[PDB]
Amino acid sequence: GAKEAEIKELLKLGDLPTSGQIRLYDGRTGEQFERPVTVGYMYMLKLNHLV
Amino acid sequence: TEFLKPRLVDIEQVSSTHAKVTLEPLERGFGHTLGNALRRILLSSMPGCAVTEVEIDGVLHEYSTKEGVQEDILEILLNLKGLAVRVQGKDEVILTLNKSGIGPVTAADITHDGDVEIVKPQHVICHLTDENASISMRIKVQRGRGYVPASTRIHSEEDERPIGRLLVDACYSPVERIAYNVEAARVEQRTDLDKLVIEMETNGTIDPEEAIRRAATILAEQLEAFVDLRDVRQPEVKEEKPEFDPILLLPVDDLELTVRSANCLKAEAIHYIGDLVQRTEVELLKTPNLGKKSLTEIKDVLASRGLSLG
Amino acid sequence: TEFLKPRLVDIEQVSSTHAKVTLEPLERGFGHTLGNALRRILLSSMPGCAVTEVEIDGVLHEYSTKEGVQEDILEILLNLKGLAVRVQGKDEVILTLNKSGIGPVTAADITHDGDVEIVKPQHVICHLTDENASISMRIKVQRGRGYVPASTRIHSEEDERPIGRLLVDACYSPVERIAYNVEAARVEQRTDLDKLVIEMETNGTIDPEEAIRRAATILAEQLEAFVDLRDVRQPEVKEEKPEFDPILLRPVDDLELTVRSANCLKAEAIHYIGDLVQRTEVELLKTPNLGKKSLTEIKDVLASRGLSLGMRLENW
Amino acid sequence: QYVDASRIVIKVNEDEMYPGEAGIDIYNLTKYTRSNQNTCINQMPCVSLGE
């Protein structure tokens, strides 16, 4: 597979920090946290347990 | 329309530093917009006044000492970045702080080197221990209404600063909590609609019962993005809300009032003239604040729209 | 008092349904969050245009099809309902589809020589198969408000709509898609503040450089909300009924009055003159067919008894 | 050669066209029924007239 070094190359199309770990803020307060934080976009699912 | 000119009717003070603060009625849940969009405004570009730089009779560097203090010197760096105030005028003012002999170091030990009010008497700074002890400092103070780091001021950060002139960021506002909830409005018939709740809390200097009524209308600085971005106001209405004189439901404001007296009265949930008729000069005081010109003589013009007491 | 209310700023039109105004300079972070407010209004609650009701030349329900088309009606109507337009007098127009004869059926087969701009003159519905075949309908259309599907009232929505009078997905809201982006401030005084960028794209009912205030009003008229601090409310006013002496224990029969009055005061349910003695005259204008003459009969038929209007009492 | 929310047809040439056929295929599609975990079932086109 497409191991870490290839992710760090392909990320120069998203152009966000090639760490994958970014200076996140909080929408309610305009703050920025004491360290960069893991972010991205995941493929996600809703599941037939259904409450 | 159901943007029903939704005034801040329900405030509920908790004592000279904290109120409930609520906004109603709202569009089928719209406290979810306001309670997170406007709450960011209330943390961006706000008023008040505070300490910004300091010059002290021993702190030529932080690794120093003063045999007679109890902080020695370094635990004085505790309430500077901590003392706050209000100020009539322009964005630079000055104090000194001049304790001699045994004691704390306190508002009762200040001297006014400029235009500075002090709604923070309880902000004790440090101590002294002998019948011949002393300490002295200058303090720089600013008001503005926005923020910059103490060492990213960048152009105004290359001035002559003596070996003893300590340096701070834009500390100008003393608030200690702001919360957020959403539940139903009071509006006793228009009830498909919500309220925002924000439970703000301070250190004295402002109750959230003052720090709202132009402090929130900073929204007038967030609207170039959305409501005629250009030069093209179009024909479409405001479509209103009237309920008329002298109806028994009308707000206490319909007695004609005297500054935030209007806010701190309606905060008792006595928002309306109909029950103010109970408030005879025998048990009248139950309200927050409401301390002077309001309280004094309005009781005879109350009888000119036409109400009475007895 | 030190408001800013900024104006004038930018233009980048692209194609009627998308243009790209942008905003700079901004104070120290404003562009990073504000674009999430209109993300409610430009979906849920907006005026714009939609279809409200439909009636059809042989089709009592959309869950079906018509013996002569080459496409089938439920999954056609799912595409027809997006036809939303503009209107220039009063809010409504009851348009018509006028179609007969071989070939496609389109927004060019619809009535359009009046107060209406059918900005979708390239929409298509279905086909017809012979030089004398038909498909035709009335089509109620408004500017309206909201994102209303064809079932929203949820009860009293069994309602008695004459069999073929379709209620319709009145989704008046001319946008669902809205979003934003950001830069650093680039106004050639600076490189030291922030900058907002807009990516609104529409139902085609308007373009992002054509109109806006009502679409930003649940954010602009949310400001008076914090000042000018007088408000709004309604009462309770009646008592629980009824005892002697039987001066109040009487229907309208006792009054000696006219028949249309006795039909509409019967609809207004005033079966005891014990409450007609105390209901306000303006509060009789609360059911139709009760106008300027019947409202005027009341003013002496009560007095004729040896009674009056306007007689509230502390026990009934 | 036709496309509809439940129906699709195509036409073919003498490079494949069997010894007496009309030159056609069909690719019609499902609509709404029950399933073993009460999931919905449906299908929709991905092509157009003359592709």
Query: What's the 3-state SS for chain B?
Result: CCCCCCCCCECCECCCCEECCEEEEECCCCHHHHHHHHHHHCCCCCCCEEEEEEEECCCCCCCCCCECECCCCHHHCCCCCCCEECCCCCCCEEEEECCECCEEECHHHEECCCCCCCCCCCCCCEEECCCCCECCEEEEEECCCCCCCCCCCCCCCCCCCCCCEEECCCCCCCCCECCCEEEECCCCCCCCCEEEECCCECCCCCCCCCCCCCCCHHHHHCCCCCCCCCCCCCCCCCCCCCCCCCCCCCECCCCCCCCCHHHHHHCCCCCEHHHHCCCCCCCCCCCCCCCCHHHHHHHHCHHHHCCCCC
Q: Cα(B264)–Cα(C294) distance, rounded to whole angstroms? A: 50
- Cβ of B180 within 8 Å of Cβ of A28? The answer is yes
Kindly give, in sequence order, each residue whose CB lies less than 8 Å from that of residue C301, ignoring residues fewer than 6 positions away.
C255, C256, C257
For residue C77, what is the enclosing H or E element?
Answer: helix C73-80
Q: Which residues of D touch C127 (CB under 8 A)?
A: none
Residue B291: how many other CB atoms lie within 10 Å: 12
Q: Cα(B83)–Cα(B77) distance, rounded to whole angstroms? A: 11
Residue C275, φ and ψ in degrees, nearest 5: -110, -30
Q: What is the amino acid identity at position C236?
A: E
- Burial (CB < 10 A; 0-12, 13-18, 19+), residue C171, is buried
For chain D, the chains sharing at least 3 beta-carbon pairs closer than 8 angstroms are C
Contact call for residues B108 and B72 (beta carbons, < 8 A): no
Q: Cα(C9)–Cα(D36) distance, rounded to whole angstroms? A: 58
Contact call for residues C231 and B4 (beta carbons, < 8 A): no
Note every long-range contact of C176-181, with CB atoms under 8 Å and residues 24 or more positions apart, other chains counting: C176/C42, C176/C43, C176/C147, C176/C203, C177/C201, C177/C202, C178/C38, C178/C39, C178/C42, C178/C43, C179/C35, C179/C39, C180/C35, C180/C36
Side-chain-side CA neighbours of C85 within 13 Å: the count stands at: 29
Contact call for residues B24 and B9 (beta carbons, < 8 A): yes
Q: How far is B132 from chain C (nearest CA, A)?
A: 50
SS3 C136: strand
Residue C110 DSSP label: B
Percent helix, strand and coil across chain A, each to the nearest 5: 15, 10, 75
The nearest alpha carbon in chain C to A25 belongs to C32
Residues C119-128 as b/e (b if ≥16 CB within 10 A, e otherwise) read: bbeebebbeb
Q: Cα(C198)–Cα(C20) distance, rounded to whole angstroms? A: 6
| B235: nearest Cα among C212, C45, C24, C261 | C212
Residue B293, φ and ψ in degrees, nearest 5: -70, -45
Tokens 């997905």 correspond to what residue? C169
Q: Please give the structure tokens belonging to residue B213.
A: 């009524």
Q: Please give the structure tokens belonging to residue B207.
A: 């109750």
Q: Cα(B147)–Cα(B159) distance, rounded to whole angstroms? A: 20
Q: Cα(B295)–Cα(A43) distance, rounded to whole angstroms? A: 64
Contact B283/C at CB under 8 A: no
Q: What is the amino acid identity at position C32?
A: H
Residue D11, φ and ψ in degrees, nearest 5: -135, 155
Q: Cα(C46)–Cα(C172) distance, rounded to whole angstroms? A: 7
Q: Cα(B259)–Cα(B264) distance, rounded to whole angstroms? A: 10
- Burial (CB < 10 A; 0-12, 13-18, 19+), residue B38, is buried
Q: Cα(B5)–Cα(B241) distance, rounded to whole angstroms? A: 7
Q: Cα(B141)–Cα(B87) distance, rounded to whole angstroms? A: 9
Q: Cα(B98)–Cα(C206) distance, rounded to whole angstroms? A: 68
Residues in chain D: 51
Q: Which residues of B touch C216 (CB under 8 A)?
A: 223, 226-227
What kind of experiment solved this structure? cryo-EM
Residue C272, φ and ψ in degrees, nearest 5: -130, 115
| C46: nearest Cα among C144, C170, C152 | C144
For residue A9, what is the enclosing H or E element?
Answer: helix A4-10
Q: Please give the structure tokens belonging to residue B54.
A: 């300091």
Q: Please give the structure tokens belonging to residue C267.
A: 């609809």
Q: What is the amino acid identity at position C150?
A: A
- Cβ of B39 within 8 Å of Cβ of A28? The answer is yes
Contact call for residues C44 and C220 (beta carbons, < 8 A): no
Q: Which residues of C touch B228 (CB under 8 A)?
A: 7, 212-213
Q: Cα(B279)–Cα(B212) distance, rounded to whole angstroms? A: 27
Q: What is the amino acid identity at position B257?
A: L
- Cβ of A28 within 8 Å of Cβ of B44? The answer is no
Q: Which residues of D touch C71 (CB under 8 A)?
A: 4-5
For residue C303, what is the enclosing H or E element?
Answer: helix C294-304
**Chains D/B: 3 or more C-beta pairs closer than 8 A?**
no
Contact C72/D at CB under 8 A: yes
Contact call for residues C309 and C277 (beta carbons, < 8 A): yes
Q: What is the resolution of this structure in A?
A: 17.0
Q: Cα(C196)–Cα(C187) distance, rounded to whole angstroms? A: 12
Q: Cα(D25)–Cα(D22) distance, rounded to whole angstroms? A: 9
Contact C238/B at CB under 8 A: no
Contact call for residues C82 and C193 (beta carbons, < 8 A): no
Q: Please give the structure tokens belonging to residue B142.
A: 């600013």
Q: Cα(B281)–Cα(B271) distance, rounded to whole angstroms? A: 19
CA B82 remoteness from chain centre: 16
Contact call for residues D2 and D29 (beta carbons, < 8 A): no
Q: How far is A26 from chain B (nearest CA, A)?
A: 9
The nearest alpha carbon in chain B to C231 belongs to B7
Q: Which residues of A touch C33 (CB under 8 A)?
A: 27, 30
The nearest alpha carbon in chain C to B261 belongs to C229
| C203: nearest Cα among C118, C82, C88 | C82
Q: Cα(C15)–Cα(C89) distance, rounded to whole angstroms? A: 27
Q: How far is C209 from chain A (nearest CA, A)?
A: 28
Strands A21-22 and A37-38 come out as antiparallel
Q: Please give the structure tokens belonging to residue C161.
A: 């709509």
Contact B172/C at CB under 8 A: no
- Cβ of C29 within 8 Å of Cβ of A30? The answer is yes
Q: Please give the structure tokens belonging to residue C284.
A: 């009789």
Chain C stretch 61-100, residues whose beta carbon is closer than 8 A to a beta carbon of chain B: none
Q: What is the amino acid identity at position C42?
A: L
Kindly give, in sequence order, each residue whose CB lies less than 8 Å from that of residue C151, ignoring residues fewer than 6 positions away.
C157, C167
Question: Left, alpha or beta for B276 (phi > 0: left; psi -120 to 50: alpha)?
Answer: alpha
For residue A10, what is the enclosing H or E element?
Answer: helix A4-10
| B115: nearest Cα among B83, B84, B87 | B87
Preceding peptide of B104 cis, ω within 30°:
no
Residue B228: how many other CB atoms lie within 10 Å: 18
- Cβ of A29 within 8 Å of Cβ of B180? The answer is no
Which of C26, C27, C32, C33 should we substitute to test contact with A (largest number of A Cβ atoms within 10 Å)?
A: C33
Q: Please give the structure tokens belonging to residue C189.
A: 């005084």
Q: After which residues is chain A broken (C to N over 2.5 A)?
A: none
The nearest alpha carbon in chain A to C37 belongs to A27
Tokens 């054509």 correspond to what residue? C210
Residues facing C18 on adjacent strands: C15
For residue C105, what is the enclosing H or E element?
Answer: strand C103-106
Q: Cα(C68)–Cα(C129) distance, rounded to whole angstroms? A: 6
Q: Please give the structure tokens belonging to residue C75.
A: 């999954």
Residues C210-245 as b/e (b if ≥16 CB within 10 A, e otherwise) read: eebbbbbbbbbbbbbbbeebbbbbeeeeeeeeeeee
DSSP state string for C250-288: --GGGG---HHHHHHHHHTT---HHHHTTS-SGGGTTSS
The nearest alpha carbon in chain D to C75 belongs to D5
CB pairs under 8 A between A and C: 6
Question: Left, alpha or beta for C8 (phi > 0: left; psi -120 to 50: alpha)?
Answer: left
Q: Which residues of A touch B40 (CB under 8 A)?
A: 27-30
Q: Cα(C77)–Cα(C166) distance, rounded to whole angstroms? A: 11
SS3 D23: coil
Q: Cα(B268)–Cα(B252) distance, rounded to whole angstroms? A: 11
